[PDB]
Design a protein around this nucleic acid. Structure first.
Lengths: 271, 65, 116, 65, 100, 88
RNA sequence: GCUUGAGUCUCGUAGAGGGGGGUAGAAUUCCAGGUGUAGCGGUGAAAUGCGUAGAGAUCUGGAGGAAUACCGGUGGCGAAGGCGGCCCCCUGGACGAAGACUGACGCUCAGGUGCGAAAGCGUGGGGAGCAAACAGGAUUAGAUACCCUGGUAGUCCACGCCGUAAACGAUGUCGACUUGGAGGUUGUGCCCUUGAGGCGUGGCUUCCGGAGCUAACGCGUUAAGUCGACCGCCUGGGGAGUA
């Protein structure tokens, strides 16, 4: 699982890799791929909008089924697979009618196991039901927010939301930010935590690791001139001002969510 | 811990209170965890209980009279 | 006012104060008094007498509710917990029962290690 | 100081609260063998019988209610 | 195989609707070769404390011999069945007769 | 644990009859069978140190019986370690 | 060869023995609301603190974490550390009855290996109560203490690590023998359950005491008595369990 690398070289000194020998070894299922041209952080106007993005290895899009709209057809997990686009291992599931789909591999899933969608489904890990058939207290993942939209919460590695209380039409999830929230009861949500739970113990070792995961260097504020950042300048290492993002607004504590439109589902913001 | 005490009572009659637990647990649990003095106090008092049994066995004396 | 019929009388008797409060079947307070508010700031409020004075001063302010008979219910140890019963009796309340809900943990939280 | 388990074949059960309601007090809490006889073996067996009763709500943990 | 003793308290509405419960569970033990030895239902009894408020539940006893797969059937149904409030399985108790 | 069923299976397999239960060969057979059954319950739970001490005593007592057997009859020692798969 | 040591097996028994997973109730805290008011709290007395933004009190609902009131017992189990709500799963040991089987398969162990309270350390969660550090109040000649109000690590969970304690019956392990008394607990045989029983015998066990031993206190069939085997260890105090 989590094997630390021997220090034959500076930069390998500190690497800690996450191997998953159960993963597939070879090319992926082709009919569920498509080109994923990189962006480098630039919108249709050409300009960098989110800095520190661009480069890195190339990767194709593994079309991961999220809606999970195949009710009443049991699907056997054909093989786990490494998905670059994502934090979690994907799983290639084969339905009894000759269908193959990618899903987010839950924590306890193995090649050959059997999962099932639908309202009729059981309460194994991997089964996706509307959060009206799922018992309260059950720990679900790949949760939806609008019935049929596809799934938007607890998608990444080792993440799950907890159905803390059901109430009529509205099921209350405590979200992994520690944030209470309500969703419509009709929203599908597969069962069980998401696999690759250890994706948080790998440490990348060196600078090239980020540089090929697609990140670019983060020049601090105080390393720039006054013209290029609110921070910046001095005759050697001066800050003397309250920290702010490069575009002015104050950082290190300043609450910026202001929606007023989805406040009714927020029961208790994170803390 | 609860008694009706029919109004023709004129009494305290709460011997149930100081006979069952109220102070026997509360004023000694109100503080003081210490994890180890229970055994120490236990065998001090238990030596005294066996000493009461020894008194009851060997209570044959002469009254100095 | 509201002409409430009957009620319960909670005596939260601590080692320092003796809080007397009057409540009803539904558990809503009608008035209260405390041996620290009735004078006796300090060494005297931890005495049984100040407790009965609190019980008298809480029989006050419930004459306006016409409370007929009282279910006295006490809580915790202390010099009170008996003189407040005496005073809630001598105030002319038909003490219908003398119970308590004095809380006993079933070996729950660790208590403070105080008082060396 | 009678142990009903002296003639009680069909040893202590958690359904016979008819028989269990004698080994508790007004509060619902077990009584000591030093005061009710009850050979220690059967006192332990009835202790866990009363605990299972309480779980099945055949007996109250306290007399709070 | 072992001799478990199952008890479970069902809500009073589903006490109006109990017998299907016993029938299905005994069907499980049947189809898994176990054998039932008691069904001493006690009906609507009142609970000494308010359980999962709306007290005064309805008890059922089984006292059946079976293996752990059967008992898993029973216990998982017990947990994920919103009618039953507090089942409890036990061990041998040497399957018995009447006189609750 | 070795339910009476399986222990009688082993006694029949390794003994001179059904009465021969104390022979060194049958004691070694029972200890090995129980150890091989227990090693799975230990590779799970990984932390049951008291049961682990039980297992150590089992393997040490089987070691003592196997040493006694090799000292007494080398031929039966050979055939026994062959039949049970010990000390390859 | 042999069975008196040592084991294996058949039947059961008692248990906070162990690891894994569920779950219940009381209670402290927090959150939201209801009633209600100027006090709460704390102490030797106070004050910091909390309170008219409406607290403390009482009631209902919800969340979450730790430990399991009574049973409770020099009671039990374990090699020692240690282990106490209930239920389920995997698991070790002990011991009793009778009978059979092997036939010295034993005892003790340098080095080695393993387990080893609490604190503490790394990684990740969790965090109700308590609480080093810390801050304030008070005491005081001072008070970087006791005391009070708060409070972070930590205590909790998983996985590693440390490898120490007054880790102490300050009593190395195994075997034999040597007067007694009352107990506790767990087996079992016999006779009348003749009616809450009486007579034996196994195990673990607490206290008094005899011969003896000891410098004395004391130990006293569970020896510190009489011996046998193997191990560890000591050789004036301090320096020093330090360099």
């Amino acid at each position: 699982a989590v094997v630390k690398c021997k220090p034959t070289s500076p930069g390998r000194r500190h690497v800690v890799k996450v191997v998953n020998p159960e993963l597939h070894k070879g090319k992926p299922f082709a009919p569920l791929l498509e080109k994923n041209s990189k962006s480098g952080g630039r919108n249709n106007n050409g300009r960098i909008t989110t800095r520190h993005i661009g480069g890195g290895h190339k990767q194709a899009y593994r079309i991961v089924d999220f809606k999970r709209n195949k009710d009443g057809i049991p699907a056997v997990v054909e093989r786990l697979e490494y998905d670059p686009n994502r934090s979690a291992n994907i799983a290639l599931v084969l339905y009894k009618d000759g269908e193959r789909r990618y899903i987010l591999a839950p924590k306890g899933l193995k090649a050959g196991d059997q999962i099932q969608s639908g309202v009729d489904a059981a309460i194994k890990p991997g089964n996706t039901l509307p959060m009206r058939n799922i018992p309260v207290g059950s720990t679900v993942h790949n949760v939806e927010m609008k019935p049929g939209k596809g799934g938007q919460l607890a998608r990444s590695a080792g993440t799950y939301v907890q159905i803390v209380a059901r109430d009529g039409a509205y099921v209350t999830l405590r979200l992994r930010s520690g944030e209470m929230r309500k969703v419509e009861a009709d929203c599908r949500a597969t069962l069980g935590e998401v696999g690759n739970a250890e994706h948080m113990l790998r440490v990348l070792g060196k600078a090239g690791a980020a540089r090929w995961r697609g990140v670019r260097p983060t020049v601090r504020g105080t390393a720039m001139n006054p013209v290029d950042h609110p921070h910046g300048g001095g005759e050697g290492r001066n800050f003397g001002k309250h920290p702010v993002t490069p575009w002015g607004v104050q950082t290190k504590g300043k609450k910026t969510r202001s929606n007023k439109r989805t406040d009714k589902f927020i029961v208790r913001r994170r803390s | 811990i609860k008694v009706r005490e029919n109004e023709p009572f004129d009494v305290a009659l709460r011997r149930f209170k100081r006979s069952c637990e109220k102070a026997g647990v509360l004023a000694e649990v109100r503080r003081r965890e210490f994890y180890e003095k229970p055994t120490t106090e236990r065998k001090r008092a238990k030596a005294s209980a066996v000493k009461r049994h020894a008194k009851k066995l060997a209570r044959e004396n002469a009254r100095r009279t | 006012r509201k002409q409430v019929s009957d009620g319960v009388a909670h005596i939260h008797a601590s080692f320092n104060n003796t809080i007397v409060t009057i409540t009803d079947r539904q558990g809503n307070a009608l008035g209260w008094a405390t041996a620290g508010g009735s004078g006796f700031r300090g060494s005297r409020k931890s005495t049984p007498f100040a407790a009965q004075v609190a019980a008298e001063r809480c029989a006050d302010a419930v004459k306006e509710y016409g409370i007929k008979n009282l279910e006295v219910m006490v809580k915790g140890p202390g010099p009170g917990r008996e003189s407040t019963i005496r005073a809630l009796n001598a105030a002319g309340f038909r003490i219908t029962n003398i119970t308590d809900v004095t809380p006993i943990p079933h070996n729950g939280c660790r208590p403070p290690k105080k008082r060396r | 100081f009678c142990r009903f388990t002296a003639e009680g074949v069909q040893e202590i059960d958690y359904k016979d609260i008819a028989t269990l309601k004698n080994y508790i007090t007004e509060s619902g809490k077990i009584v000591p063998s030093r005061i009710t006889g009850t050979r220690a073996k059967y006192q332990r067996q009835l202790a866990r019988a009363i605990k299972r009763a309480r779980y099945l709500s055949l007996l109250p943990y306290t007399d709070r209610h | 195989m072992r001799h478990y003793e199952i008890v479970f308290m069902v809500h009073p509405d589903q006490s109006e609707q109990v017998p299907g419960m016993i029938e299905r569970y005994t069907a499980a033990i049947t189809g898994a070769e176990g054998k039932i030895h008691r069904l001493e239902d006690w009906g609507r009894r009142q609970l000494a404390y308010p359980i999962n408020k709306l007290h005064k539940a309805h008890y059922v006893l089984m006292n059946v011999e079976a293996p752990q797969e059967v008992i898993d059937e029973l216990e998982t149904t017990f947990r994920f069945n919103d009618a039953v409030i507090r089942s409890m399985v036990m061990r041998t108790k040497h399957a018995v007769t009447e006189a609750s | 644990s070795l339910s009476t069923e399986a222990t009688a299976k082993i006694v029949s397999e390794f003994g001179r009859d059904a009465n021969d239960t104390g022979s060194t060969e049958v004691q070694v057979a029972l200890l090995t069978a129980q150890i091989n059954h227990l090693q799975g319950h230990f590779a799970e739970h990984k932390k049951d140190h008291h049961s682990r001490r039980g297992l150590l005593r089992m393997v040490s007592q089987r070691r003592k019986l196997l040493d006694y057997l090799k000292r007494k009859d080398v031929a039966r020692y050979t055939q026994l370690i062959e039949r049970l798969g010990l000390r390859r």
